[PDB]
Amino acid sequence: QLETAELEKGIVRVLVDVIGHRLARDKNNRPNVIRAYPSDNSNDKGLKPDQPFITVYCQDATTPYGWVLDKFVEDDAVCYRIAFQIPVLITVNGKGAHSIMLELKQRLEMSTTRDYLADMTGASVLDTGAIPNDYTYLNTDFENSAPLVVTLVKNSVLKDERGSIIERVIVDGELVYEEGQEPPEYTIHLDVDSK
Amino acid sequence: WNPIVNVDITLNTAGTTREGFGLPLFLASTDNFEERIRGYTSLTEVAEDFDESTAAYKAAKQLWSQTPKVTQLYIGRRTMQYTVSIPDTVAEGSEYSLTVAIGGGVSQPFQYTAKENDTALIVLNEFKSQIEASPTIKDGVNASVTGMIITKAGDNDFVKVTSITPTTSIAATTADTASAALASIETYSTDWYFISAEDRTQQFVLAMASEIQARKKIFFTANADVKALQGTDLTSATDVPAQLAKSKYTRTVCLWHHTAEFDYPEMAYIAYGAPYDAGSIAWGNAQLTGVAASLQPANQRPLISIQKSALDTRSCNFIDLDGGVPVVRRGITSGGEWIDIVRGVDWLESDLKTSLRDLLINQKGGKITYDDTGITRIRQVIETSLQRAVNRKFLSTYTVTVPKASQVALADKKARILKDITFHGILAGAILDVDLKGTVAY
Amino acid sequence: QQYSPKDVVCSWNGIAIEGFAPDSFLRLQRTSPLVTPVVGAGGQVALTRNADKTGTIEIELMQTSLSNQMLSAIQAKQDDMELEEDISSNFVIYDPSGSVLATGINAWLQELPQIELGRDQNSKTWIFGCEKLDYTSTIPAS
Amino acid sequence: TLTIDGKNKILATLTPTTIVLHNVDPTADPTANKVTQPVAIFFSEPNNGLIASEDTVNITVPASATVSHFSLWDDNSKCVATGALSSPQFFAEEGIYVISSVSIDLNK
Amino acid sequence: TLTIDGKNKILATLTPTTIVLHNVDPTADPTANKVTQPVAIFFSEPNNGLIASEDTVNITVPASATVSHFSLWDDNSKCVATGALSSPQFFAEEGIYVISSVSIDLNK
């Protein structure tokens, strides 16, 4: 199954291991990779972490690959498999954000990294966008940000608990000489079971 | 060691065979062969276990003469009830012998020769105690005392007693009213299609026809009684053809021939359409080689028109001598249905059953789900199965209607049941006889 | 009861072909016109009834769809079968709205798909023949 | 009918131990879409073909979660039984769902 | 209700071993009306909540006896299942009763 929340969680763990040697460390010496719009229970907001930090944000989830990729039957349930394409926005904030972002791009193509990302997420990278060197004016100085749009593709399998598959077929057939003949010339009754 | 080229010419004859829907089975009351449904592939093979006067060999020769040889012939045995009885008085110490054989491992002889004072019986009752004491015969052989009948009981099914001087006589086949014989033969193998029998009694013949009507097979009989070629009203006579027609049995073929007693002409009829395909043939006008025309037992002349018309009333087929060419006419079953239609229908069921079996058992494209896609899969197989009939020139058009998923009751889905699937095909007939009304010769 | 592409289902050789491309994914077409009128030099018109009803069914499945492997597996098996065995089966297309009402009687696999790997995910077009593309209708002869 | 002695002996091997609540019906798949964590449930001895819970069970359901169906488990992770609680309940804030009595019975 | 997996596990412990015929419905006092001898009966492994007899068993009914009901006594002399036959039959002489197949089922 596909859950955007789980996908963002999976990406964050990957970014910590992949690009962690260039970010800042908190009180637990954990590289500052956070999910966008942080918030705990109810309205408990989240503080802006230290500089060189990474923000992960799943922009949306489109399905340009058709309504249903395939429909198979599991043990006793009909399972639909839909193909999704999730654009995830990874943005690095802080001084020298562009240099940090560039390293991640050249590191998101390595086979070892993508194999790691394929695990614990279940998705595979489709492509990586362009990195704009953005300068925004907060209050006094300019904060460097380098957003990047990583596009992921994943297959979600959901089970319809109201399937009730076929196991027996009963066929009644008649043979006639012309279109009509209310008394059929010969009658066919079939009964095929899975036993 | 084998030579580089191994050549072995023999001054034998032709006999190239052909394969087609249906394999004949002959229910013969015999004593040889291992279990039921022995089988045979050539006339020589059927002669290595049967004699010329033996019923099975007589049937085998007729079926296997033709020209397109049938691939294989199945021969089954009816379970046997050998009865023993002393024909004379017991004289002092006259030696009596008998050997009972069951399964494969039983060849125990038995001698009593103990009648010093007087027996007037005894010996048979003495055998009863002895026959129930043999270590390898004790189980499987049920006996009695009369006033004996060595039948079978439990586990072992085949029994056989044979002597030289005293008796070991009779046959008295246990297999009763087909059902008993059929139940035994079904347990062994059910790959046969055409069924016949050596017995010709009214009780037995009427029993098979009712029994065959239940399952998907065709029964080929042959009657020769005179009482069938005289009656023109069905509900007047008690002849077997009349009995079959009255019961409306569509899976029983009757061939009225004068050799129906000592020979089995139905074998020739089977071997006319069995080698070929199913439904792409006409069992009507047929030039059966070897067998002669239907002769009158009283005059030894071919059947007259009224006699044939009386036969047509009972739907029993005959051999009409048209242009002085023995031709099996009618080609219809006792139920009024053409034989090819019955055979084609049986093939259609087999093909539909097999093709539909693949989705359910072999899970060809996966388990069938209960929606519009799953029902469509079933329609495709049914439509494909009927399409082979059209290519076979059996049907001409078909029309399959399936229920819509939304119109299916909740009960069927919970039971995982799909009903209300119907198809409607149109048969393709065959021209068997014409009527040319010439205008004039002005 | 309007046309919706989510209910159109196609089934061939007992399989449940699925995973259609978002764009045009099914394309039936008869290979010959019903009649070919012949116009005389004078102006008289005669009609020739074509006894050729064969058609062509094209299916556009996306490459990662599972039915792509199923169809290819059948094709590989069909090559190893002897010449006497059949390679055709009716092509039933069902749609509740009645947009399509054509059957694919005796449909065979004509052309293998053309793989077009690119930046994004492309489709694979399977082309099926047929001996008689029979157009049907809900309305009977009345 | 079946024997009560037989009904008692047959039911002595069930021994459900953990209970898990689901928002959807777990009949199709009792291994999926779980809500709570496995919480121990202890049953009595088979009597009159009906086992019953010994003590009450409190299941801590997380916030913004719905429970509608329940399921029981054993030591080797094998879902012996599934069912539906009285009515769906939505726990806005983190709350507790208490099981008052579970009575698996076979006496029809 | 129980699960298919749950039914299979539970059925694997009944293990009937012997069958005894009766003349009166053995509901209560199953030790009475013990017409025949404890002939052994073999059952297969549970499958979809159903066990079936491995082979046909023959019951050595004594002469001048009537049998209408049966019971499946297990290893430890417990009557786990009663039941009636098709119709009460009078074995006026010595004879044997053939049990083609007996199946215990919970799918109900």
Side-chain angles (χ1 to χ4, degrees), chain A residues 1-74 77-118 121-163 165-195, chain B residues 1-18 20-29 39 47 50 55-91 93 95-105 107-111 114 120 123-143 147 153-154 156-169 171-176 178-235 237 240-321 323-434 438 441, chain C residues 1-141, chain D residues 1-28 30-44 46-53 56-92 94-107, chain E residues 1-28 30-44 46-53 55-107:
Chain A
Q1 212 196 325
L2 163 74
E3 308 268 276
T4 63
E6 308 295 326
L7 215 55
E8 289 186 325
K9 292 188 183 349
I11 290 195
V12 164
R13 294 161 151 299
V14 174
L15 297 189
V16 158
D17 263 358
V18 159
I19 182 52
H21 53 286
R22 305 241 292 157
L23 308 174
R25 314 140 280 191
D26 47 14
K27 314 142 91 183
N28 324 295
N29 184 16
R30 187 226 170 220
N32 265 349
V33 187
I34 87 164
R35 297 219 286 126
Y37 301 163
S39 164
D40 207 7
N41 53 64
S42 182
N43 317 50
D44 292 7
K45 333 250 164 194
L47 312 179
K48 170 196 242 209
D50 276 11
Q51 279 328 305
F53 76 91
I54 292 196
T55 286
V56 175
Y57 173 43
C58 158
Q59 273 194 330
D60 68 355
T62 175
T63 68
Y65 293 0
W67 40 97
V68 157
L69 196 93
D70 67 29
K71 160 160 51 147
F72 58 100
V73 183
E74 201 84 340
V78 199
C79 306
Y80 294 90
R81 178 195 326 265
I82 307 95
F84 290 81
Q85 161 176 307
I86 293 107
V88 172
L89 172 96
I90 291 131
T91 165
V92 175
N93 303 48
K95 262 184 193 253
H98 209 237
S99 147
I100 294 180
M101 192 66 277
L102 270 193
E103 175 157 8
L104 186 47
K105 215 190 182 245
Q106 306 188 90
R107 215 167 269 279
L108 274 175
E109 315 275 40
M110 281 175 98
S111 211
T112 85
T113 286
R114 268 169 24 242
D115 268 304
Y116 184 13
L117 182 45
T121 52
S124 46
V125 189
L126 182 82
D127 82 26
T128 58
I131 301 147
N133 194 349
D134 303 358
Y135 274 140
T136 46
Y137 182 41
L138 306 160
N139 258 6
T140 88
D141 304 332
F142 277 90
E143 165 171 330
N144 197 355
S145 50
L148 162 73
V149 194
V150 167
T151 314
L152 303 182
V153 279
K154 191 190 182 19
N155 284 327
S156 86
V157 168
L158 212 81
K159 317 180 109 51
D160 177 30
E161 57 269 19
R162 329 211 197 89
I165 43 183
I166 305 277
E167 274 145 12
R168 263 187 90 190
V169 176
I170 317 186
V171 189
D172 313 277
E174 55 252 8
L175 299 192
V176 299
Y177 277 113
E178 271 156 350
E179 279 269 10
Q181 202 166 346
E182 194 274 335
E185 183 74 15
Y186 205 110
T187 305
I188 285 268
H189 178 86
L190 224 66
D191 188 289
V192 167
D193 67 348
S194 154
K195 320 336 152 173
Chain B
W1 170 90
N2 44 285
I4 310 301
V5 58
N6 185 55
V7 47
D8 52 36
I9 70 146
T10 87
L11 300 107
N12 192 314
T13 321
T16 86
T17 192
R18 208 186 170 297
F21 191 60
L23 269 198
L25 160 77
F26 186 60
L27 215 61
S29 57
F50 292 91
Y57 185 76
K58 291 216 203 133
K61 158 190 321 278
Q62 275 175 303
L63 165 148
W64 259 353
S65 73
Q66 296 326 303
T67 82
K69 311 274 157 176
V70 195
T71 55
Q72 203 191 56
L73 161 66
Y74 286 115
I75 282 198
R77 79 150 91 92
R78 295 154 57 63
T79 54
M80 269 329 326
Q81 220 169 25
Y82 297 98
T83 319
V84 284
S85 153
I86 199 55
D88 50 291
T89 203
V90 201
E95 180 58 271
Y96 306 129
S97 76
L98 67 90
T99 323
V100 196
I102 73 168
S107 315
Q108 305 305 117
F110 292 97
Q111 335 287 305
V123 179
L124 302 191
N125 208 287
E126 196 284 330
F127 267 131
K128 218 197 89 169
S129 295
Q130 204 181 339
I131 209 55
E132 277 139 15
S134 167
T136 74
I137 284 302
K138 49 201 312 294
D139 42 18
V141 192
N142 199 96
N156 157 82
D157 66 307
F158 152 68
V159 289
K160 161 157 209 196
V161 308
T162 175
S163 80
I164 296 106
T165 176
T167 172
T168 45
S169 41
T173 79
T174 82
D176 85 82
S179 49
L182 279 189
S184 149
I185 195 45
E186 293 279 74
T187 53
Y188 194 91
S189 148
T190 70
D191 81 306
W192 47 278
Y193 188 63
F194 299 110
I195 178 57
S196 47
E198 168 187 20
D199 186 292
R200 304 287 209 193
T201 56
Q202 165 148 359
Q203 267 183 322
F204 186 72
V205 164
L206 271 294
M208 201 95 68
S210 89
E211 214 64 17
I212 285 308
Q213 192 70 35
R215 51 193 38 94
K216 295 300 136 65
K217 323 264 181 316
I218 312 195
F219 184 24
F220 274 70
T221 87
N223 201 2
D225 60 1
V226 166
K227 302 206 332 273
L229 328 182
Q230 53 170 20
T232 321
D233 178 36
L234 266 184
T235 61
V240 164
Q243 279 311 121
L244 296 171
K246 281 191 254 224
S247 66
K248 284 307 284 178
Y249 284 168
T250 70
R251 303 171 150 293
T252 289
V253 181
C254 175
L255 170 69
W256 200 103
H257 206 234
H258 60 276
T259 64
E261 200 54 32
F262 42 100
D263 288 25
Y264 308 101
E266 64 248 74
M267 269 327 103
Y269 208 14
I270 288 188
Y272 173 78
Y276 299 106
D277 210 36
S280 66
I281 209 69
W283 299 72
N285 317 331
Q287 217 182 352
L288 280 189
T289 185
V291 283
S294 197
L295 291 187
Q296 292 162 318
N299 329 299
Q300 293 309 308
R301 281 225 281 195
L303 293 191
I304 58 110
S305 320
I306 285 305
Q307 280 171 343
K308 281 132 154 197
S309 152
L311 258 180
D312 184 30
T313 317
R314 317 145 180 272
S315 283
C316 183
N317 314 259
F318 50 92
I319 306 204
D320 173 21
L321 197 65
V325 268
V327 167
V328 169
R329 224 171 201 260
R330 281 303 111 177
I332 207 180
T333 71
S334 318
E337 306 287 355
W338 306 99
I339 309 155
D340 63 71
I341 282 144
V342 189
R343 187 147 157 249
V345 152
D346 287 356
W347 165 79
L348 208 33
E349 282 195 40
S350 318
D351 182 83
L352 265 161
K353 204 178 316 301
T354 299
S355 314
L356 259 179
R357 194 72 62 53
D358 272 28
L359 290 156
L360 294 152
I361 306 311
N362 300 21
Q363 271 137 254
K364 191 165 202 338
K367 295 200 109 47
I368 315 175
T369 166
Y370 219 136
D371 49 9
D372 264 330
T373 88
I375 299 173
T376 295
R377 296 238 311 250
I378 278 144
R379 175 131 91 93
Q380 202 268 298
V381 158
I382 289 166
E383 207 141 326
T384 292
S385 305
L386 296 166
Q387 172 62 30
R388 314 196 157 102
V390 163
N391 309 311
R392 185 171 300 201
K393 296 265 277 322
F394 177 45
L395 297 182
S396 88
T397 82
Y398 42 85
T399 299
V400 198
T401 82
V402 285
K404 171 168 171 206
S406 321
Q407 325 291 93
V408 173
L410 257 204
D412 305 14
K413 287 161 163 232
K414 274 175 34 203
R416 299 212 253 267
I417 272 296
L418 181 51
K419 45 177 50 74
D420 309 341
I421 303 191
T422 54
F423 64 87
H424 173 116
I426 281 156
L427 301 141
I431 307 308
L432 278 184
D433 35 16
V434 317
Chain C
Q1 181 144 332
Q2 203 47 57
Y3 163 63
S4 42
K6 303 176 145 27
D7 324 286
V8 182
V9 67
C10 311
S11 99
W12 181 69
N13 216 58
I15 86 188
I17 294 189
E18 77 217 292
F20 300 120
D23 312 331
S24 287
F25 57 89
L26 186 94
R27 272 184 302 292
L28 325 180
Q29 157 190 100
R30 280 243 186 130
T31 206
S32 47
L34 288 202
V35 316
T36 79
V38 63
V39 152
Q44 289 96 51
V45 168
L47 299 112
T48 294
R49 72 308 174 267
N50 284 337
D52 159 8
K53 316 169 175 330
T54 83
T56 279
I57 300 107
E58 318 187 10
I59 288 138
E60 281 226 43
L61 305 155
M62 302 266 288
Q63 51 202 111
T64 37
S65 168
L66 184 62
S67 284
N68 269 33
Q69 326 275 320
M70 211 85 58
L71 277 178
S72 157
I74 296 189
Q75 165 32 35
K77 165 202 291 153
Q78 290 206 323
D79 263 348
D80 285 316
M81 254 175 313
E82 295 279 29
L83 201 73
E84 272 93 349
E85 321 275 20
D86 70 15
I87 63 201
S88 44
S89 306
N90 289 21
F91 195 90
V92 195
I93 303 154
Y94 164 100
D95 167 318
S97 98
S99 206
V100 79
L101 263 173
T103 295
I105 288 144
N106 271 345
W108 58 87
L109 189 43
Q110 222 162 265
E111 301 186 30
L112 280 158
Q114 160 195 335
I115 297 105
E116 172 128 46
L117 305 188
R119 174 154 71 261
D120 214 347
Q121 213 187 219
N122 308 20
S123 57
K124 311 231 302 210
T125 306
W126 295 81
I127 295 199
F128 295 78
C130 95
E131 141 185 340
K132 182 173 150 62
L133 201 68
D134 176 15
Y135 288 65
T136 46
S137 85
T138 89
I139 314 303
Chain D
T1 88
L2 212 54
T3 88
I4 287 134
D5 174 352
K7 288 201 244 172
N8 267 40
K9 142 177 215 185
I10 180 50
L11 270 162
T13 316
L14 211 53
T15 71
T17 65
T18 86
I19 177 156
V20 157
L21 305 188
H22 310 251
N23 34 18
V24 282
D25 188 315
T27 281
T31 198
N33 200 321
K34 295 201 220 322
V35 161
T36 86
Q37 303 293 71
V39 159
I41 168 56
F42 294 120
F43 272 103
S44 61
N47 94 314
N48 167 56
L50 178 171
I51 39 154
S53 46
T56 183
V57 191
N58 299 339
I59 323 158
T60 313
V61 160
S64 304
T66 323
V67 293
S68 73
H69 302 84
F70 75 87
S71 79
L72 323 173
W73 292 77
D74 67 344
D75 293 28
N76 41 306
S77 303
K78 216 201 172 283
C79 183
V80 307
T82 67
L85 318 87
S86 50
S87 306
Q89 300 298 324
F90 182 70
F91 292 129
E94 159 142 319
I96 286 188
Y97 204 95
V98 317
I99 292 301
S100 71
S101 86
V102 170
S103 61
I104 272 183
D105 80 52
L106 185 150
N107 304 336
Chain E
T1 204
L2 298 183
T3 71
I4 302 318
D5 263 8
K7 301 158 146 275
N8 303 347
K9 190 151 85 61
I10 207 173
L11 258 288
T13 68
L14 209 47
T15 88
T17 56
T18 207
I19 170 175
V20 160
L21 263 177
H22 287 245
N23 52 69
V24 170
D25 159 357
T27 281
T31 54
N33 312 283
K34 209 170 308 304
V35 184
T36 65
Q37 302 323 90
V39 201
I41 187 156
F42 303 170
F43 275 90
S44 44
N47 159 353
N48 165 37
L50 197 135
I51 40 183
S53 47
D55 86 7
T56 294
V57 317
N58 316 266
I59 282 188
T60 184
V61 164
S64 150
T66 322
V67 294
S68 62
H69 302 85
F70 62 100
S71 55
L72 291 73
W73 291 87
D74 58 354
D75 273 308
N76 295 65
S77 62
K78 294 332 171 63
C79 187
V80 313
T82 68
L85 321 158
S86 323
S87 296
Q89 283 313 0
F90 187 161
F91 262 58
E93 271 156 359
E94 159 61 31
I96 71 78
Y97 204 122
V98 161
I99 297 304
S100 44
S101 156
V102 153
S103 77
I104 307 294
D105 159 359
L106 271 194
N107 315 136

